[model samples]
Target: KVFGRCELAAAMKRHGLDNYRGYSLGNWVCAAKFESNFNTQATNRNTDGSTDYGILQINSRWWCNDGRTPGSRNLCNIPCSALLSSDITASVNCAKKIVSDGNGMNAWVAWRNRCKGTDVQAWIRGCRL
Candidate 1:
């Protein structure tokens, strides 16, 4: 599923992730744009033979199992495809868990490289809370 930026922001707010764990909604929004462009079905193969899943681009190596990558920590304990769905409650919860574990946005390379320290207001631009 694909979401417009505002649509995604609304859903994220409904899930109580608007300003979760010291990360702002703009952080999440901007990260999502660079990670998956708001496409829930997004996936990307990593050089290590693992893959990223969902709008958050969670990784199979540590977060979820793709049923193909071996020795996944499966830290999220949910299938990778689960993250690839439009209903993102599980995904968001898992993401929160990750951040709470002290990784914060550092868990996402996109967040570190693109969203961090950037003027991310445009991510939530034109969206009314």
Candidate 2:
């Protein structure tokens, strides 16, 4: 499922990411745009052989259990499939922990390079999906 920017922002806010850790909701929205282009089922294979799953691209190396990652911590305590849903609760919950776990939003390199410190208003103050 692909989310429109504003729709994704609304969803992110509804689920608990609004001002999470002092970062604006747009940070999460912005990360999703760059990470997955708002595609719920998007995935990327990392150079280390771990996979990043879903819109937030939660990684198998230190997050969800994909069963193939060598030392995957399953920090999100969920199957990798959970991140692939349009429902997004698992992705949202896992991301919340990603920050609470001390990595901050820098967990996603896309966020750190593309979203962090940028004005993400384009993703939020919207009139369209």
Candidate 3:
């Protein structure tokens, strides 16, 4: 499912992603915007043979066990299949873990390229918060 912008923001807030790991709510929202456009079932593959999964593009090489990464770490201890579910509960938990680890929000390239060090507040301006 492709979530609405505000809808995704609200969900992020509901799941405690707002202000998570020193990132503003808009930072999270912005990452979600560019990474997957609030999409729930996105799967993008990298040339390294590791794949990115779900709205936040959590990677298979380190975060999930997709069973094909050759050195899959499964850091989140979750099956890659769970990231595809529209519920996003699994994805949110894994995302939190991703950011909580030493990588922080830099876990996602979308955040590094677009969400970092900007007036990210615009990403959440109209939201009730």
Candidate 4:
């Protein structure tokens, strides 16, 4: 079912290691949910049409430039697609660094603690990657 959600679930799926769906995906998906409600191609624009970017709410203009290279989606050395397609390590590691203020799950345990009070944990726990 990686093909189902295509980009969103696929990107989140990559946020796991060898075969473990740990804090990385847990928090990454949380961030995605918080940011764009898990809209894979989600973009936001001001009254003007000049500001449009971020899938998984990455803020592409700040994180990535306006391009489609491997590193474009991720905004780092790893391309978002490549993170999904080639390396799970790159994806999971990258996700960990992209969720918080400028990256992935910061204070993951704390996040889990707070998020568990809601249905987010249930969502992640039931999610099959």
Candidate 5:
């Protein structure tokens, strides 16, 4: 599905970000601008052959096979339905739980920093997803 600024804003709101977490929308928009372009329908093949799917990039194995089920077993598989949950308080929260309990994005931040010629990677990454 096609995504725009509104979708990204909504995702950020769902993740409890009031102001882009101190970085401009450009920061987020830049990283995801090309890769997923804020599209929740995005998916990726992990280095180990697993799949990372959807907004915030939660994986099938992480959220699915790691002891979970969608809607009490497969009556039907829904399309264009990853993340964007009204009941979920934070988008980053789920992402944190799936990856080192929240260290995965720290890797992203590290990558970001290194690109900008920074020395050490900050450990205090995105707050609580």
Candidate 6:
């Protein structure tokens, strides 16, 4: 497990995520909440036979290699398991890369379905960031 909402906000702020690429800290905080509840080891299997990995629930179809998958963009060039570590350094870097590719937060279904157009302020309500 990793930091919950409050602690995660601080960590993200320390990592310089306060307003990355025009995205507020609230955006990342809210997305991570629904994606994995800030659990670094979290993973979910999709009905499409693809798997999501780590805090961001990054998809095996485009981001990382799970070895079992036939074709993967492997754009991160790292193993999916790497994202599951408590460190989250790799995961954060990869997530930034993902957003840089023009996907933004829409890459996460959770963000689109849950975090979008909602009261995101609560995600970082009391955070110092």
Cα error, candidate 2, residue 62 (Å) = 0.8
lDDT scores for all predictions? 0.88, 0.87, 0.88, 0.42, 0.42, 0.85
lDDT of 1 by residue, 1-129 (tens): 899999999889888887798788999989889999899999999999999989998889988878889887899899898998889887898888888887788988988999899887778988987
TM-scores of the candidates in the order shown:
0.94, 0.93, 0.94, 0.44, 0.46, 0.92
Query: In model 3, what is the error at residue 28, expressed in angstroms?
Result: 0.6
Q: Which tens-of-lDDT digit does each residue in 13-99 have in candidate 2?
A: 789898899878878888999999999999889899999999988889988999899876887899999899979999999888888
Which sections of candidate 4 miss by over 4 Å?
Answer: 1-11, 14-24, 46-52, 67-119
Work out how many backbone clashes candidate 2 has: 0
Highest lDDT against the true fold, candidate: 1
- Which parts of model 5 have CA positions greater than 4 angstroms off? 19-31, 61-63, 66-93, 96-104, 109-129
- Colliding residue pairs in candidate 1: none
List the pairs of residues colliding in candidate 5: 92-129
Judged by lDDT against the true structure, how good is candidate 2? 0.87
List CA RMSD, all candidates. Answer: 1.1, 1.6, 1.1, 7.2, 8.7, 1.3
List runs of model 1 lying over 4 Å from the truth: none
Over 4 Å off, model 6: none
